[PDB]
Homo-oligomer: A and B are copies of this chain.
Amino acid sequence: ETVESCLAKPHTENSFTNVWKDDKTLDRYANYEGCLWNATGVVVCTGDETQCYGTWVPIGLAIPENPEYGDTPIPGYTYINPLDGTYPPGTEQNPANPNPSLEESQPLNTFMFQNNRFRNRQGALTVYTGTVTQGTDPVKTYYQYTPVSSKAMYDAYWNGKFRDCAFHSGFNEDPFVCEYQGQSSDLPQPPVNAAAHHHHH
């Protein structure tokens, strides 16, 4: 395939396996038919983030990276994109500070929701967006927390769905795994990307 041929493929609504997520933007990707695809909004994924069902758009050539599989629908959850811009910070609607913050070490008060790490500071939600560096000799490494811009994430919070995990002190360890992991929804099988050749070269 070429970049042009990939971009010409039709968008496809189906389950893809071997899904990966960009640690900074939280975007989900997968390889299929020699092309790289990006999931667009409304996503249903398994508990782990191995498979996701939704509207996939071809964005370029497949990139190197990457049990069994049946024909029966499997359990999953409707996944929320924490940074989708539906409730942007620094606005009248969402007055939270729009600037990301830095932590020298992973904070003690974080909670895990749909495989993302979050912090709650009196109703202001932030999400872990990977590490960043500052300076040279020595290079300082920081854990970056970015203000959440997802209305659906805040709706869940305001509906009291994170009572067991968003108000917790922390310490000795890492994140509190929330009991709520989203609305249940099944993924059709098998993934269209099942075949091993979609994941090679």
Contact = CB atoms under 8 A, between A and B. Distances in A.
Interface string A42-85: 10000000000001011111011000000000000000000111
Interface string A148-185: 01011000000000000000000000000000000000
Given A93-B64, A133-B99, A152-B3, A40 B42 contact: no
Given A36-B85, A55-B57, A41 B99 contact: no
A83 B134 contact: no
A178 to B, nearest CB: 21
Contact of A100 (B24, B40, B84): B24
A119 to B, nearest CB: 15
Given A3-B152, A22-B85, A102-B132, A40 B61 contact: no
A84 B38 contact: yes
* Number of copies of this chain that the complex holds: 2
Given A41-B7, A102-B133, A86 B61 contact: yes
B86 A60 contact: yes
Nearest to A102: B134
How many A residues are at the interface, by size bracket? 35 or more
A27 interface: yes
> A36, A92, A93, A97: which has the most chain B beta carbons within 10 Å?
A36
A5 interface: no
Interface string A130-152: 11111000000110101001011
A115 interface: no
Given A25-B25, A59-B85, 9 more contacts: A11-B55, A24-B83, A38-B40, A59-B86, A60-B86, A99-B130, A101-B134, A132-B144, A134-B142
